[PDB]
Design a protein around this ligand. Structure first.
Ligand code: MG
Lengths: 137, 131
């Protein structure tokens, strides 16, 4: 194919932009954005919290960026910086967990606008293929 | 993937993460070509129709604005890749070259994933991007 609309990179970037735009708009009341929300989600995954290097790896962020994101979340008392008995941990507070729960509802609703109508198995397969790329290991 | 709480299942996150990785790779691949993903895109749109392509339709299909298009087509016309918006013999030769490079880049990410699976993802992305 010679058409632009068949360019898989073009399509990923176009659809990604649309979805993230809708998610950022939906997130407004939470004070969060896709990036800060993502960090909160990572921090909420385990009770002990997430390792800062783990966040970097997962999200492709520089240390300085992560620091900034975490600073923002900590200022709002959604996250606290903890130590691992020498790994730097970011643990969600109860409030952070409540906000994460609220935000997820909004994010899911936003995804729904674009994915409802597509068979779950088809969406699921897309998720799986993207996973094999975003998390090769 | 259903009621999952993992970021690794968040489809929006995955799209942007993979999209960003591919875009980065494709830009590197286009370096020798002198194009970027955005200029390349405009060249592609021009080569689509054997003769011609509008301007205001580009902003819509790229999700950008006329200003950026002007600059983009100017970059191309300045090299004689397009004539103000049709491609030149040259453009068409560069477009085919760039294509091989873009395809090689995509391959680094998608090789190993069965073609039917990748082809299907293209289909579903298309349905979303262009209903
Ligand atoms: Mg999976």
């Amino acid at each position: 194919s010679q058409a632009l609309s068949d360019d898989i990179g073009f399509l990923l970037s176009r659809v990604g932009g649309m979805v993230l735009g809708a998610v950022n708009k939906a997130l407004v009341p939470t004070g969060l954005r896709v990036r800060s929300y993502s960090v909160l989600v990572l921090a909420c995954e385990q009770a002990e919290g997430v390792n800062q290097r783990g966040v970097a790896a997962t999200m492709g962020l520089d240390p300085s960026q992560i620091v900034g994101l975490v600073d923002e979340l900590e200022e709002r008392g959604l996250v606290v910086r903890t130590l691992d008995p020498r790994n730097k941990l970011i643990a969600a507070t109860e409030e952070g967990r409540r906000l994460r729960d609220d935000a997820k509802a909004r994010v899911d609703a936003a995804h729904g606008r674009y994915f409802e109508g597509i068979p779950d198995t088809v969406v699921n397969q897309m998720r799986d293929t993207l996973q094999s790329i975003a998390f090769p290991t």
